[PDB]
RNA sequence: UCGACCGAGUGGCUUGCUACCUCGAUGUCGGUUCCCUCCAUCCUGCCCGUGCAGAAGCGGGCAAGGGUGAGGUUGUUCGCC
RNA sequence: GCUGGUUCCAAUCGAAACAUGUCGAAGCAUGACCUCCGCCGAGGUAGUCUGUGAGGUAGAGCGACCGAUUGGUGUCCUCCUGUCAAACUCCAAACUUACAGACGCUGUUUGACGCGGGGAUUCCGGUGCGCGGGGUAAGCCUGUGUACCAGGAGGGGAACAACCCAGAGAUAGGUUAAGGUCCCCAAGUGUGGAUUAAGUGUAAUCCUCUGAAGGUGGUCUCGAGCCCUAGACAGCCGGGAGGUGAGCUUAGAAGCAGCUACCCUCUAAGAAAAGCGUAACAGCUUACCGGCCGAGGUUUGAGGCGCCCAAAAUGAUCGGGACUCAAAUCCACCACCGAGACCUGUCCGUACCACUCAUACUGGUAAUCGAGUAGAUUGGC
């Protein structure tokens, strides 16, 4: 199952927004994959990552 | 990803473990193709190269495996052939095949013969100042050709003045 | 400090804002205080007389009596009781 | 040629007051205004600055080598009368000491030179150019940032959309 | 091939700084003899470039296995020959 | 006034390594600070809040003074433009501080706050953190506030005065803290993701754990623009024509020595030529067009981890073994191990309370008692 997540994280100059898809079997677990992934790939704290909508 | 290589006509391809063997009228070539999480298999008339991994390093090896196999197709049917030409200025160079090695006498007037040993099933055929290097495995043939040229290398003198040697002239395609 | 005089390090505390410069208004120089009253000690840069040692700027003492026109004000410096002789011009009533 | 490791940090109090400091050497900086001085900066479509990424002291000899190697490039490329201007915005106000000539007795240094204090994120150089010459100012700045202590950012502050695409 | 200015470093062989260790004493300099080591390589091996025709070089890379000696002045280390 | 030594047990309190004077700086006196005794008799103020006051450091700014410090113009000349300050200030904190009230805590049999007297010890200090001043720097010199070592155990940290937890009577059962859970070694070869291939790393702090400027189509992730099935990007094939060898220059200057111009036709398209090349023409490409092929391409911004930069002396290391979808790193999460801390039974000491001639008994209270060098006080062998 594919959920798409959109939100934004702090950046140089303006804040930057993304859209991301994950294979998690839930809307909660899909959200925590983005938290987990961006934590790894961007060295970002979970509080820094702000999520607007999960679809 | 997945890539499918249709085996051509009058060619057989067998895969045992990480080894793949290709047989044709011109001969047989076996290759080890080994990279993490890339599966190479023979399904019917089509050879299949696939992985669950999409990363740049994986794609690199996939593309490499494809070209390796296709080259094997070409080698067992059409064959692989390198052309070579001996040039000398002052000292006549004698280039012959003796057994499994090609031997070069009187290079730059040298008393001592230079030798290189042919790789695999590769054939070296000399006609006058022309050579042709040929066989089913492009690895073996290409290297045998290269070794012949490399064998006439000179480090200590100006190469622009001292040009004697055997050189690759024609290089294969497809 | 490079010297031990009483005006050492007083550049700020003994200087007016340029707007408050010039003769100070007489009303506060003639102010009358009663024994027991709490007063704040602040030297007025424009008034030369009736001053106290600059170390005591900012003290709040208790008026205990008068000596001539000056007041005798009791303060505690650290743990030590002292009596300061100071005119109304440098005194303001607490609250 | 004393190394900048000696002078580059902001560890010291600001020491600028010429009324209390004598024998200050002259600056080696030739000019703070380069290219076309009679022309306004705002006449140009493109504005590019070299930004310092760490708070540091850059001494006057380093400012000059840096400025020189950047302006020499512009002149070599856009031409001596070429259409552009470059500003070195900072001046070397901070006076430098060395304890030379006793050891640590009476160690307060004699006056050896000057440096400019630059906070991280500030514009050291700003160049104003025509769109065609913008890669030439980027290149001048690359040479310039090699001659000063800190790592630097090259920033196009006006007319980036016009550049390349 | 040489390479200024400016900028960033590494070493711990000089010199300086510090005064942490020893003043109920850790025997000086230079030399000698005998052992081990480091590499930033002088030669030797294998290479690259050349303003590499050759020969003779110059510059650079890998590399510490072996070698790097005898004499005249000076206590000299160093250095000069 | 300098070095060495000064002999039994226990209980309470518990420093100063600083200020002033000193032929004083290896000493002393006087204060600060420690302790003991007598007196006084109800307030006290280590925290916070509020009110009434003090202040000019950080920051900031300067046509607000002052002094530094740019350039360009308009006839020394009231705009514009570039910078600063420990000994500048039109501004201006956080914060420190005087006094009062309130709450808190404390004191009135444990007498506080204070007064008087006896006895000292001490006046080589050190470290961390914050703020400093000097110095290229220092395991450097010299301040300042604070907590710690000194005189502070026990648990971590490989070891290790001052880094983390932690302040500690005896004994006993628990549960945690710091820090750990692949083995050495008590507890996970824990879970959900992702990154790294460098054994990077497995190194909080540090003389102690280095690694910099400058590089990186190594790799991962997130954007922005443009092009593309009316076929993009690349490759391969074909075509790159005529006026014409443009004019000038020149002996000849033919796309391509130089000056100037840079028109025009045939076209699907092709420069008065972008680069090699020739003595000059050959000759090879580029622009530009068509075909084959078929799905992304291209420019650019940001981030993560790694790579290069990277040379030392007896035997290489993260404490060691060794570890690679980790036993590394980042984002989360789950269960555990693990102190003398915390909880809990009994006992001991000390202080206090009740009773008493007397803790000699007996009973009671301590969340608000239990570490200690120098030293003061007191019971005992
Ligand atoms: Cl007074
Ligand atoms: Cl001898
Ligand atoms: Cl304690
Ligand atoms: Cl290893
Ligand atoms: Cl006893
Ligand atoms: K000694
Ligand atoms: Mg030679
Ligand atoms: Mg000895
Ligand atoms: Mg080497
Ligand atoms: Mg050896
Ligand atoms: Mg005793
Ligand atoms: Mg006892
Ligand atoms: Mg005393
Ligand atoms: Mg002041
Ligand atoms: Mg300031
Ligand atoms: Mg203060
Ligand atoms: Mg001691
Ligand atoms: Mg175990
Ligand atoms: Mg390592
Ligand atoms: Mg660190
Ligand atoms: Mg005790
Ligand atoms: Na006044
Ligand atoms: Na002296
Ligand atoms: Na730099
Ligand atoms: Na030294
Ligand atoms: Na001794
Ligand atoms: Na000796
Ligand atoms: Na060697
Ligand atoms: Na000699
Ligand atoms: Na002292
Ligand atoms: Na003294
Ligand atoms: Na003495
Ligand atoms: Na109270
Ligand atoms: Na500050
Ligand atoms: Na303590
Ligand atoms: Na330990
Ligand atoms: Na390692
Ligand atoms: Na004691």
Distance in Å from F285's C1' to B163's CA comes to 27
CATH architecture of structural domain B1-79: Alpha-Beta Complex (3.90)
The bases of strand F with some atom under 7 A from any protein CB are 51-57, 67-73, 82-88, 90-91, 97-100, 114, 132-138, 140-141, 192-195, 213-215, 218-223, 225-226, 299-305, 329-332
Beta-ladder partners of B83: B132
Candidates D53, D125, D121, D118; CA nearest to D84 is D125
3-state secondary structure chain B: CEEEEECCCCCEEEEECCEEEEEECCEEEEEECCCCCEEEEEECCEEEEEECCCCHHHHHHHHHHHHHHHHHHHHHCCCEEEEEEEECCCCCCEEEEECCEEEEECHHHCCCCEEEECCCCCEEEEECCEEEEEECCHHHHHHHHHHHHHCCCCCCCCCCCCCCEEEECCCCCC
- What is the strand order of the sheet D123-129 is part of? D33-35, D84-88, D123-129, D46-52, D152-158
Alpha carbon of residue B72 to chain centroid: 10
CATH of the domain at D79: 3.90.1170.10
Candidates D30, D125, D31, D137; CA nearest to D78 is D137
What SS3 state is found at D135? helix
Give partners of B (≥3 CB pairs < 8 A). none
Distance in Å from F87's C1' to C45's CA comes to 22
Contact between D41 and D85 under an 8 Å Cβ cutoff? The reply is yes
The phi, psi pair for B148, rounded to 5°, reads -60, -45
Contact between D123 and D49 under an 8 Å Cβ cutoff? The reply is yes
Contact between D92 and D59 under an 8 Å Cβ cutoff? The reply is yes
Element (H, E) at A37: helix A27-42
Rounded Cα distance, D96 and D60, in Å: 11
Q: How many domains are contained in chain D?
A: 1
Q: Cβ of residue D162 near strand F, that is under 7 Å?
A: no
Task: Assess whether the region B1-79 and the region B80-172 belong to the same CATH fold.
Answer: yes
The phi, psi pair for A6, rounded to 5°, reads -125, 145
Provide the H-helix boundaries in D97-161.
Answer: 134-145
Rounded Cα distance, B99 and B102, in Å: 8
Contact between D130 and D45 under an 8 Å Cβ cutoff? The reply is yes
Residue B65 neighbours by CB distance under 10 Å: 22
Rounded Cα distance, C72 and C49, in Å: 15
Alpha carbon of residue B23 to chain centroid: 17
D108 CA from centroid of ligand 23 (Å) = 14
Alpha carbon of residue D91 to chain centroid: 8
Q: Cβ of residue D99 near strand F, that is under 7 Å?
A: yes
Structure-determination approach? X-ray
Rounded Cα distance, D77 and D151, in Å: 25
C68 CA from centroid of ligand 19 (Å) = 84
Rounded Cα distance, B69 and B48, in Å: 10
- Domain ranges across chain B: 1-79, 80-172
Rounded Cα distance, D135 and D61, in Å: 26
Q: Cβ of residue A29 near strand F, that is under 7 Å?
A: yes
Q: How would DSSP label each residue in C7-20? A: TTT-TTTT---TTS
Alpha carbon of residue D7 to chain centroid: 15
What resolution in Å is listed for this PDB structure? 2.4
Contact between C59 and C29 under an 8 Å Cβ cutoff? The reply is no
User: Could you tell me the sign of the dihedral formed by the alpha carbons of D5, D10, D11, D16, in that order?
Assistant: positive
Contact between B74 and B80 under an 8 Å Cβ cutoff? The reply is yes
- What is the strand order of the sheet B27-32 is part of? B12-16, B19-24, B27-32
Beta-ladder partners of B103: B96, B115
What SS3 state is found at D106? coil
Candidates B63, B65, B61, B56; CA nearest to B20 is B65
Q: What's the first-to-final CA gap in chain D, in angstroms?
A: 44
The DSSP secondary-structure symbol of D13 reads P
Contact between B101 and B41 under an 8 Å Cβ cutoff? The reply is no
CATH code: domain B80-172 is 3.90.930.12
Candidates D154, D131, D151; CA nearest to D141 is D154
Q: What share of chain C is helix, strand, coil (3-state, %, to 5)?
A: 10, 30, 60
- Give residues with Cβ within 8 angstroms of B46, minimum separation 6: B4, B5, B6, B7
What SS3 state is found at D43? helix
Distance in Å from E77's C1' to C50's CA comes to 79
Give partners of D (≥3 CB pairs < 8 A). none
CATH of the domain at C33: 2.30.30.70
Element (H, E) at D58: strand D56-59
β B46-51/B2-6 pair status: antiparallel
Q: How many domains are contained in chain C?
A: 1
Rounded Cα distance, B117 and D31, in Å: 71
Nearest residue to nucleotide E54 when comparing alpha carbons to its C1'?
A: B157
User: Residue C7 belongs to what domain range?
Assistant: 1-95
Rounded Cα distance, C3 and C38, in Å: 33
The DSSP secondary-structure symbol of D80 reads T
Residue D89 neighbours by CB distance under 10 Å: 14
Distance in Å from F172's C1' to D34's CA comes to 87
């Amino acid at each position: 199952s594919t959920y798409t997540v959109r939100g934004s994280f702090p950046a140089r100059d303006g804040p930057q927004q993304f859209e991301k898809e994950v294979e998690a079997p839930n809307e909660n677990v899909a959200e925590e994959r983005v938290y987990s992934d961006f934590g790894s790939q961007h060295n970002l704290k979970r509080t820094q990552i702000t999520i607007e909508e999960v679809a | 990803p997945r890539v499918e290589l249709e085996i051509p006509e009058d060619v057989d391809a067998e895969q045992d473990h990480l080894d793949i063997t290709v047989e044709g009228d011109n001969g047989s070539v076996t290759r080890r193709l080994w990279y993490p999480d890339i599966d190479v298999s023979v399904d019917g008339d089509t050879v299949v190269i696939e992985s669950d991994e999409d990363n740049a390093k994986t794609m690199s090896t996939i593309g490499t495996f494809q070209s390796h196999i296709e080259n094997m197709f070409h080698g067992v049917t059409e064959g692989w052939e390198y052309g070579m030409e001996v040039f000398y200025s002052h000292f006549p160079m004698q280039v012959n095949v003796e057994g499994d090695e090609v031997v070069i006498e009187n290079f730059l007037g040298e008393k001592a013969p230079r030798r290189t040993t042919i790789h695999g099933d590769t054939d070296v055929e000399i006609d006058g100042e022309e050579l042709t290097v040929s066989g089913p495995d492009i690895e073996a043939v290409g290297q045998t050709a290269a070794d012949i040229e490399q064998l006439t290398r000179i480090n200590d003198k100006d190469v622009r003045v001292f040009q004697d040697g055997v050189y690759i002239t024609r290089k294969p395609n497809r | 400090p490079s010297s031990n005089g009483p005006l050492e390090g007083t550049r700020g505390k003994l200087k007016n804002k340029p707007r408050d410069r010039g003769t100070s208004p007489p009303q506060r120089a003639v102010e009358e205080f009663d024994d027991g009253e709490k007063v704040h000690l602040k030297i007025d840069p424009s008034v030369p007389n009736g001053r106290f040692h600059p170390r005591f700027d900012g003290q709040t003492g208790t008026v205990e009596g008068k000596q001539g026109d000056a007041y005798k004000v009791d303060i505690v410096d650290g743990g030590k009781e002292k009596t300061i002789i100071v005119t109304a011009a440098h005194l303001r009533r607490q609250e | 040629d004393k190394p900048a490791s000696m002078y580059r940090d902001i560890d010291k109090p600001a020491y600028t007051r010429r009324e209390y400091i004598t024998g200050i050497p002259g600056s080696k900086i030739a000019q703070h205004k380069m290219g076309r001085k009679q022309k306004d900066a705002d006449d140009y479509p493109v504005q590019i600055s070299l930004i310092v990424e760490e708070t540091v002291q850059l001494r006057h000899g380093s400012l000059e080598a840096s400025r020189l190697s950047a302006n020499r490039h512009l002149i070599k490329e856009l031409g001596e009368e070429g259409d552009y201007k470059m500003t070195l915005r900072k001046f070397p106000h901070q006076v430098l000491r060395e304890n030379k000539q006793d050891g640590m007795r009476a160690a307060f240094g004699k006056i050896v030179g000057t440096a400019a204090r630059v906070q991280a994120g500030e514009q050291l150089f700003t160049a104003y150019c025509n769109v065609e010459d913008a890669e030439h100012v980027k290149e001048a700045f690359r040479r310039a940032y090699n001659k000063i202590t800190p790592s630097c950012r090259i920033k196009v502050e006006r007319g980036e959309e016009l550049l390349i695409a």
